[PDB]
Amino acid sequence: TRKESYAIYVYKVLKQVHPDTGISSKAMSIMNSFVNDVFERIAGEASRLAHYNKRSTITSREIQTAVRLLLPGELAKHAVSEGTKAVTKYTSA
């Protein structure tokens, strides 16, 4: 049956970043875990923020501030910029 995975997207980005470089089955697996972990961590903390503010909906404002709690500085800052960029990009297009 279908087992979904971020295996393609991780490949894509790896090729973008280290084009003469492959990933092992285990390594992929690990990567695949990391995405899922950070997904929940983010998604969850966003969910708390909606709730805490009697709010029925998770908008990227939530996902943003979620990010500012979860990540350490340089990581957070870049990620925020990176994120609000693709949103802007997304609206217009």
């Binding site: 998604a43 969850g44 994120g83 693709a86 990009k89």
Partner: protein
């Protein structure tokens, strides 16, 4: 372009990140920028990590990123290391660090 990923100029599947946020009971309703934002932040990080892993792979003269390479990556980066400060990587191993007082004089 059709793919919402392309509209956002992203590698990550914004459709997937969208389904998940709903089949996940985080809230009644989900905005449309939230998947996008999140799908991107996911990308920043996989990139940020893969970057340092590849470098780790390189020094170890290798074509292929194996978890030691992720581990070396993670615990060498003050910040990534803290994001994953409570996490274990199968086949990671540990950083070579031997305490002073155990070294011969």
């Amino acid at each position: 372009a059709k793919t919402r990923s392309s509209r956002a100029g992203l590698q990550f599947p914004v459709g997937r990140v969208h389904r998940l946020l709903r089949k996940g009971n985080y809230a009644e309703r989900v905005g449309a920028g939230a998947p996008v934002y999140l799908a991107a932040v996911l990308e920043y990080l996989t990139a940020e990590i893969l970057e340092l892993a590849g470098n780790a792979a390189r020094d170890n003269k290798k074509t292929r990123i194996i978890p030691r390479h992720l581990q070396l990556a993670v615990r060498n980066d003050e910040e990534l290391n803290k994001l994953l400060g409570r996490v274990t990587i199968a086949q990671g191993g540990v950083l070579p660090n031997i305490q002073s007082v155990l070294l011969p004089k």
